[PDB]
Amino acid sequence: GSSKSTVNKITVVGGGELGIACTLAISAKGIADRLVLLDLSEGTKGATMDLEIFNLPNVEISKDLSASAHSKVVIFTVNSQSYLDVVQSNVDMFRALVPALGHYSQHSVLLVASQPVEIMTYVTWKLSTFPANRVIGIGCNLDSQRLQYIITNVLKAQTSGKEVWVIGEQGEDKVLTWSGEEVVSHTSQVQLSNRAMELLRVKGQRSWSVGLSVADMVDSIVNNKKKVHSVSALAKGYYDINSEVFLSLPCILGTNGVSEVIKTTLDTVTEKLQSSASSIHSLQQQLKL
Amino acid sequence: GSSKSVNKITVVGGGELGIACTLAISAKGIADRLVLLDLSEGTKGATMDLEIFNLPNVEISKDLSASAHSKVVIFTVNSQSYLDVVQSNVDMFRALVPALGHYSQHSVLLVASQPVEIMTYVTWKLSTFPANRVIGIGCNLDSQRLQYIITNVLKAQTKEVWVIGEQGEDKVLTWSGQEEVVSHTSQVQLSNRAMELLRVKGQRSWSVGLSVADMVDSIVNNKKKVHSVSALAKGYYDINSEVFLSLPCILGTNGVSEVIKTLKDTVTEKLQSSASSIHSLQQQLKL
Ligand code: NA
Ligand code: NA
């Protein structure tokens, strides 16, 4: 008792934790005018039953691919022994999905959040027959937003007009670059960069964090923010890469996807990027697409 | 590039469950202001991404006093023999609940930490709040799923069924009943089947977050909606020990306004058994 003592339609592909995280983050900020969650699991699982029960006003859950029609953004969150076999399994899942989703939303931006992101973005590009500017992966977007917060807020470091980005291939080995001027000591900038990078590298990347970074990218696209994000983008022509690979590059994002790749200062950065391009390209060559 | 081919709500804990509650509450616009208390080692930067994301009405803090004047305080924090594990959880609550109760003296305390029955009792003891304003998530998620299973998965004619008692793999159900007479055997068969469908399902952080947000909705908007929540069960089912079990309650601005009357033998048997075992564990805890 009382005793004491335009209508912005967005499709999230996948009803797993990442798909749910994207859905909730997008809904939390009111980014979508309407949101379709494509639940592609076995029906018996009832993977998204709780979301149906919760009944978000502008959210529709469906198992029908055609429910995604006329989307502004289609977000891929789905995922499947040896490395090549595991990647091939993911590729094969995308092969049965991307062409249909591309058909249903022919003017959308395709946003790839499935891993390994560089290969999966390339695969999505090849399967959709979309222009490269409208196919992007989450790349090092989360890394970059965190790194910038680390420098500004954790380290309270004086950075003057210069912005820092994590670029290239997503992984434990991380590559950074600066875009901006006030003259700064090379030694001090390297020391700052190394320190902020160490702080970043120990952090995990859980589904909720990825969902939040995805929602922010969708925000930029649907509202034509022209905000810079480091995303997986077609890297041929940059850093003397002559192969068709997607690496994370700082891009201006808006209604038509990537509007511009911004220039950064120019060497180990090129070397690491070319090495990534080489290994990614070699793995793409042995995949069945 | 071109080429082709004022309702203030505090969430206690910044772990996955705390985040899930925060996002679910924000998604529906339930909170006017939301404070997320990040009680981890600040070195981990547990909630950094949520700060970066910058939800308009969300404040992240490590300061307990930032929770002051909340309408609802949600406990999502958690954490070797079973008694030692629960004791560590109790000890964490001992350093927390009394301060949060002090800072929001007129709030409803909503306990989402496990084992929920014991942790709700502990929160009740530590806060010195009236029992109606201390509730646990109990079997709320179970109940909402079970009703959805019957109505939507089984398309069965009947919403008036609740999962009650102690949260666990072996579940107890009860019906409110009405003027329409139904065959006992048919109702038992329906219940067993829906219960099996429910029992194979997991309860992930995102699912619990959604069910929590819905309960917060009922409280802060005074919905007077029935939820099966962990509530002081003394007086019900011949239990005269102070234990919290999940009972169907009407929730509103002052927490539990009424425990609804539900069904006639095995249900009481299972409830008394749960009451006894829970009470035994409470007696051996240091509170
Ligand atoms: Na809906
Ligand atoms: Na904020």
From Swiss-Prot, chain A:
Key word NAD present: yes
GO BP terms, alphabetized: carboxylic acid metabolic process; endosome to lysosome transport; protein modification process; protein transport
Domain of life: Eukaryota
Keyword NAD: yes
Binding residue positions for NAD(+): 16-44
UniProt keyword terms in alphabetical order: NAD, Ubl conjugation pathway
Tissue specificity of this protein: Colon, colon carcinoma cell lines, normal cervical epithelium, carcinomas of the uterine cervix and peripheral blood leukocytes.
Molecular-function GO terms, alphabetical: oxidoreductase activity, acting on the CH-OH group of donors, NAD or NADP as acceptor; ubiquitin binding
One cellular component (GO) term of this entry: ESCRT I complex
Family per similarity comment: In the N-terminal section; belongs to the ubiquitin-conjugating enzyme family. UEV subfamily. In the C-terminal section; belongs to the LDH/MDH superfamily.
Function according to Swiss-Prot or TrEMBL: Possible negative regulator of polyubiquitination.
Subunit-structure text: Homodimer.
Protein name stated in the entry: Ubiquitin-conjugating enzyme E2 variant 3
Organism whose genome encodes this protein: Homo sapiens (Human)
First-to-last residue of the parent protein present: 171 to 471 of 471
